[PDB]
Structures are given as C-alpha cells and as structure tokens.
Write an enzyme that holds these catalytic residues in place. Sequence first.
Site, mmCIF file in Angstrom:
data_model
loop_
_atom_site.group_PDB
_atom_site.id
_atom_site.type_symbol
_atom_site.label_atom_id
_atom_site.label_comp_id
_atom_site.label_asym_id
_atom_site.label_seq_id
_atom_site.Cartn_x
_atom_site.Cartn_y
_atom_site.Cartn_z
ATOM 1 N N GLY B 231 -15.182 83.872 38.235
ATOM 2 C CA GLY B 231 -15.043 82.431 38.500
ATOM 3 C C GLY B 231 -13.968 81.863 37.550
ATOM 4 N N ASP B 232 -14.523 82.185 36.194
ATOM 5 C CA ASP B 232 -13.653 81.776 35.065
ATOM 6 C C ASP B 232 -12.028 82.489 35.118
ATOM 7 O OD1 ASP B 232 -15.840 80.805 33.836
ATOM 8 O OD2 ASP B 232 -16.480 82.579 32.868
#
Lengths: 306, 309
Positions: B231-232
Amino acid sequence: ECRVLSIQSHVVRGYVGNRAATFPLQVLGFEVDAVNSVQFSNHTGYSHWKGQVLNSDELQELYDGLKLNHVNQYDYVLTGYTRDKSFLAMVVDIVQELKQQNPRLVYVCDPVMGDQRNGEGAMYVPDDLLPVYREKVVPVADIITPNQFEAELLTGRKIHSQEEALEVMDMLHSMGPDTVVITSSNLLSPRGSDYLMALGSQRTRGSVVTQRIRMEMHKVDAVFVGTGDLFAAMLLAWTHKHPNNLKVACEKTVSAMHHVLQRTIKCAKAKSGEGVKPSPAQLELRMVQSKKDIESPEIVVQATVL
Amino acid sequence: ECRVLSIQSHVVRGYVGNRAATFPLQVLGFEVDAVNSVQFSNHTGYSHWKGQVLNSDELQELYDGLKLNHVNQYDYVLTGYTRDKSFLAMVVDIVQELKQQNPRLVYVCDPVMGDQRNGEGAMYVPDDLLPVYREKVVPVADIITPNQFEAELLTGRKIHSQEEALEVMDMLHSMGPDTVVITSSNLLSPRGSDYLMALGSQRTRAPDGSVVTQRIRMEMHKVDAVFVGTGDLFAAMLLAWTHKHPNNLKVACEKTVSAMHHVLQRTIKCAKAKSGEGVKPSPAQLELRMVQSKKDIESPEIVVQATVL
C-alpha cells in the site's frame, strides 16, 4: 545479492550520513539496511537544527530485533561520523559478532574526528574518541578512509611529504585494514596548488603485494557537507566490483564525486542571485539528479601507480 | 524540482513506510524529505520486532527546524500508517500551514485503519483515529488511497457492488479529495475470481460550474502470498505518475499498477527459490525486491488496462 548494514545519521532534508550513503548504494544494486543513529531536521552547516539522538542501548535493541529474527547476516558494515564513544564501542561489539558468522564480512569505516559539519547536531567530536578508534575500531576495520588530520592522530605521526604518508599508511595496515585511502591531504600536488591530493594503498594476499596510488582532483569553489559519507559509500561499491584493482575502484569513485560536485555547484550558483554566494541550503548535494553519473561515471581522473 | 515531505515509518531491514516510498520516488526524480515516525528493526509481520517511536512533540521539533531555516517549501506531502491520534492531528496542522505557503501543494494520504501489518509495531489502529481521519485529514487531502474497508468506515456506508463503490467514491469527493483510488476490494471481478479489483475516480470542476468525473476499473491477477508495504509503494508511485499525468487518472493508474505487478512477480519468484520446493516463503523471504526492480519502477511495461466506466 550484497547486504550492507549502515549505521549513520539521518537528516529530514539534505544529504549527510545515511542520506548520503543509501541512495548511491541502492542504485548500484546493494541491499542497504539502515540504522539511523540520530534524526535531525538538517545538518550543522545551517543556522538552526533540531532532532533527537539514539543511545547505545537503543542501538542494541534494534540489532537484537534482527538477531531474534535470524536476519543478521551481512556482507558489509558501514559507519562514519559519531560523537559518542559509548555508541562507537557498541558498534565494535556488533561488528565482531557479525564477523563470527561470516568471516568474509567487510567493515568500511570513515574515522571522523575534529570539527567536520555533520547531521548529529554537534560542533566537535570529543577528543576521547581517539583511543577507541585506535584500539578497538581500526583493528577490526577492513577499509578505512581517514583524511590527513585523522591519519596523523591515529598513528601519532605527522605527514610533511608523500614519503611520510606512505609510511603512515603502512602503519595503518599493520593496525589491521588491508585497504587505506587518505581522502585528502595538505600535500602540495606536483601538478598544481589547486588540486587536492589523495593517496591509496591496498595490501593484497608468502610476501603480500602492496598496490599504491595517488590521485589529484581540482578543488571546488565551495563548502559541501556529506562528501566524505558519499565517498566511502561509493568506494564500498566499486571495491566490491574490482576487489583486486584499487586503481580502477578509486578512478570510478573519484570521477563520480566530480560529476556530483560539478552539478551541485552549477545548480547552486544558478539559484542564487547574481554575485551572491550560494547558501548551505542551496549547496545540498544534487543526489537524485546525478543518478546516471553515479551508476556509470565518465572517467575524468587517472590514478598514477606509485 | 518537485519536493516531497513523507512522514512514515522507518524499518532497518525490509520495506514498509518510508522505506517502501523513498527509493521509488528518488529513482523517478523526486526530492524526498523523510520524517521517520518510528524506527523498528523490521515490520510487524515477523515474529519479533524492537524499536522506538516518535511522539507528536518530536515531530513538531523536526518541522520547526525546517521552518527556522526557511526551507519548509514543499510540492507534496505524503502520509500513511499512523497509530496515534495526537501525531495524526499534528500532521494535519503541518499540511494546513504548508498549503498557506503554497496553494498548489498536493497532499497524498493513505488512511490506514484496522489491522494492517505495519512498521509501527502496532497490532491494530485505535478507533479514536476514525473521527480524526473523517473530520480533519480527509478534508485537506487531495489524493486518497483507501482500501474497501477504509472507504466504508470513512463514509459510514457498506459496499456490496461496483455501483455502490462509485457512490461511496462520490461521497469521498464531496468530503474533499479530487482523486480517489480504492486499492483493493472484495468485489467479484468480471475477468474472474483470481483477479483483484481496484477502482479510481477523478473529479474536475469546469469554469461554467459543470463537473466531469473520470471513473475507472482495474483488474490485476492475484499473487498467492502475503506481502507487506504494498500500500505504501502504491501510494508513492501514484504520486509520481499523477504528477506526470495530472488530468489522466487512467494512464497514471496503468503505470502504477503495472509497476506493482513487476515488483511482486520478481519478489514471489525470488521468495519461492529461497524457501525451497514445497515450503511456504517466510515474511523475511517475502520482503519486496525493491533495489532489483529499479528499471521496472522507472519505466514499467504496461500489463494492465484500465476500463473506463
């Protein structure tokens, strides 16, 4: 895959310590694990700075986390500026233990002393770190990058000529490291007074053969911070690609240095008003923009074999 | 020069938070200033982890340092996982002040909530964070990347179909952000059950008051393994590609998702080779192969097509 454990400062903005060492090693293909010894807003060349420091107990906890997960296997360890003797002693203990499960591990060390600008919010390195570098660090280090001043402190000798420098480097070899590079000196280059002279020595392998070299780069019209950190990181990379050829390793490392510094000064002068000296904020190394020069530097310096 | 202020977690080994975000942005040519909200040995997916955290006062000290030196000029701010409401509130004060300094500043926010693996040694995100994300963070964010769960919590509405997902995205637009990407959902993809479905929406207001909304759908084949930090990595690359394609969410997402595909394929291939036949790769062996994917991050070959809704 080559894994590096780098324990140096972290600044939010700019490049010094781990900020100056990580990106270059990554674009060159090395897996870099970074322990940030401190976290500050910026380096000490600015008028202000704020941040926090990591103590030796905290460094130990982080390492233990790696050990508990059995992921403490490294090929290289990299350290530089430190103003805390207790932190430094902890670094030695960690390196010795890492060399135990991997005797081929290479420890690259820049033994910083004096009043060099840095990312730890300090104005000077305590004089009491000298004995720790001399008796505990250097003996376990494989590649060291002292400047002249530091090489003299470590050996108790003074360099007044090129011949005395080679003698000082030999003493450093006897203390432990097989590769020594005196990054800068006040020795007047025979090529001109505006060139900075660098000396390199590498003991390879009954009689160990020593490879000695000298290099000269024209000085740059400005004061930069973090150049020593960038230099050591790139030397690590190139000595790994050219294990038995210190000449090529240094030519590539010094050339890359030149490209980054030239781009940095040019950009600094362009952003500053006419006839205005660039400020430290404007002189931060143009790291990201020098990506290609770091990956494959055009050779602009030739090292002479001594 | 585009300068990004990224305030996320730091891990000594591996990739999550600032470690997952920094390298990609730097190779894409962005100047990244990184505030490390914590420093742990590794992410919470391992059996063990040790480290230190920063409180809101320490975050304020660092920012004051930038302010005192007059170098608090940014083009982007990027945040992700945050375990404490005081820290999150402090982040919001900083964003507002920077937007006063630069009205063109874009705030990219991944509103992580629930039980997502992280680099902040947390087991779960406290509920007392939802109110802060709803009323303080989302309203000042320009691009947000929640997963289905987070979108539902933020709007207070459940999603049961693609149509409802679009309604929820429209609700998020009304809360503030012009760009919304739902990174993953439990929705059944047309392509098949082995595909992950993501949805995106970009709202643009015309001079005459009319509103144009680009809505897209993307389907990526799943990789059977649990990764951390994706997600990062997603949010960081979306930031770079929307910058290059400001009015074309479709192309920005195709490049971002394609790069994700290349990184995960290389990662799973290396993990399986290291674990051996029949043995399931461990979290240590599943760390993203970031450095080895440099070329794919710089210019990913397009392997997914966004369908325009």
